[PDB]
Amino acid sequence: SFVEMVDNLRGKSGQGYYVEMTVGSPPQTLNILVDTGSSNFAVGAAPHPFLHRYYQRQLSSTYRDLRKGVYVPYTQGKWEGELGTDLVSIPHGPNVTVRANIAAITESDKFFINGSNWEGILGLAYAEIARPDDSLEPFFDSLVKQTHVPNLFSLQLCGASVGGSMIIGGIDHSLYTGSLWYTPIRREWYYEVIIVRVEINGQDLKMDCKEYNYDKSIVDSGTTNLRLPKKVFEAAVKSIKAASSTEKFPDGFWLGEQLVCWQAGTTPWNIFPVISLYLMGEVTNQSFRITILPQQYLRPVQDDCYKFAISQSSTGTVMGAVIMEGFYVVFDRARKRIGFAVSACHVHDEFRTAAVEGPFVTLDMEDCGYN
Numbered sequence: 001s002f003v004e005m006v007d008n009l010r011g012k013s014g015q016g017y018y019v020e021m022t023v024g025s026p027p028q029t030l031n032i033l034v035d036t037g038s039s040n041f042a043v044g045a046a047p048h049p050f051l052h053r054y055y056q057r058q059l060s061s062t063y064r065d066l067r068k069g070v071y072v073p074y075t076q077g078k079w080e081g082e083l084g085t086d087l088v089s090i091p092h093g094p095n096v097t098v099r100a101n102i103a104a105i106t107e108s109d110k111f112f113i114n115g116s117n118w119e120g121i122l123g124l125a126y127a128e129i130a131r132p133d134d135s136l137e138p139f140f141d142s143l144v145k146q147t148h149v150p151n152l153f154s155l156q157l158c159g160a161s162v163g164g165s166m167i168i169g170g171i172d173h174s175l176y177t178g179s180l181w182y183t184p185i186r187r188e189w190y191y192e193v194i195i196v197r198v199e200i201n202g203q204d205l206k207m208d209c210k211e212y213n214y215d216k217s218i219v220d221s222g223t224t225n226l227r228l229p230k231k232v233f234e235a236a237v238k239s240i241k242a243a244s245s246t247e248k249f250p251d252g253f254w255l256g257e258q259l260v261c262w263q264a265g266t267t268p269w270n271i272f273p274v275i276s277l278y279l280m281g282e283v284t285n286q287s288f289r290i291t292i293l294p295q296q297y298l299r300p301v302q303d304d305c306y307k308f309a310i311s312q313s314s315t316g317t318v319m320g321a322v323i324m325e326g327f328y329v330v331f332d333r334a335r336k337r338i339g340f341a342v343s344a345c346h347v348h349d350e351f352r353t354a355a356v357e358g359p360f361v362t363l364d365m366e367d368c369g370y371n
């Protein structure tokens with residue numbers, strides 16, 4: 001826990017959350033995107049149309065070239081660069097300084113975002129998915145090994161300019177209400193989890209639960225939307241369409257292409273269903289659920305306009321930012337588990353509320369994992 005880290009994240013809707021950090025000596029301040037969906041720490045190290053500032057190795061007395069190139073291909077985009085090590089600090093984070101690996105970005109493609117206000121990315125996931133390979137120690141591992149910071153961190157992402165908190169080294173009890181519910185981290189590469197059941201407005205989607213994790217399911221703060229496998233995505237859109245059949249929307253809408261609008265303050269929230277994702281518990285045949293409100297998957301962009309924040313995937317389920325926003329998420333690396341709880345900055349609806357509830361009985365949860 002720590003009071004100094006409570007409101008240390010900012011960003012703008014759909015553009016990711018970022019925390020401030022400093023690299024080098026003397027300290028070079030840079031806004032770094034918080035990403036539990038990758039494992040590389042990378043910062044702009046050369047001009048780019050979208051970068052307001054960038055890491056200048058030359059000006060840091062502590063830089064150290066590792067003399068190795070590097071590139072990382074995300075679903076979204078990619079960047080290329082040169083590996084090295086330098087001293088890093090998080091102003092509004094723990095009170096420590098560590099020498100970590102740093103990918104100085106020299107070239108990028110569809111990575112940086114115009115007006116995002118961040119110039120680097122902090123992959124908080126495990127070594128196994130780090131580039132060039134799992135020998136390039138990710139930041140958090142370095143932090144844990146060099147300092148006493150406990151091997152744990154939590155994220156409180158709040159919707160709307162946007163903000164939230166990244167509690168390094170623990171859990172801050174003033175950021176959530178109710179009980180925390182844990183789901184096992186299936187394997188230490190991405191923050192993989194297993195979804196055992198899915199319901200829309202109470203109705204079980206009735207799909208073989210292997211489909212829910214077809215390929216895999218991960219907790220990705222570096223992705224905006226809720227990303228579902230083809231078969232699942234189709235099932236939901238069909239279910240969500242019917243629920244809101246009272247009104248009609250262009251196909252481009254359900255495809256995330258064109259937004260929809262309503263006379264300011266008249267958004268028909270009630271016609272959009274809640275989605276319940278049931279996760280594997282810590283005990284035998286036990287699980288729990290987190291419920292998302294349409295206020296979470298209908299991202300805001302005169303009138304009130306929104307984008308359908310649920311898109312299909314070819315790489316498994318992705319519990320993105322919009323899914324994390326309603327809750328306080330705990331990445332308990334030490335106990336290989338992820339905890340969920342109603343956030344202090346939860347979404348609102350006079351007649352409905354996002355939640356984390358348990359316990360539930362769910363037989364054969366192991367069969368839900370894909371192989």
Ligand SMILES: CCCN(CCC)C(=O)c1cc(C(N)=O)cc(C(=O)N[C@@H](Cc2cc(F)cc(F)c2)[C@H](O)CNCc2cccc(OC)c2)c1
Nearest residue numbers: 014015016037038073074075076077078110111222223224
């Ligand atoms: C956060 C800003 C919001 N953006 C920004 C662009 C509009 C999104 O909404 C978005 C949409 C999509 C999509 N439409 O599918 C994909 C990504 C994405 O790829 N994010 C990674 C971090 C990242 C943020 C960034 F802003 C730009 C960027 F290029 C990448 C993340 O790490 C992916 N983890 C899974 C993984 C897959 C393959 C390879 C891996 O290797 C480790 C990991 C982000």
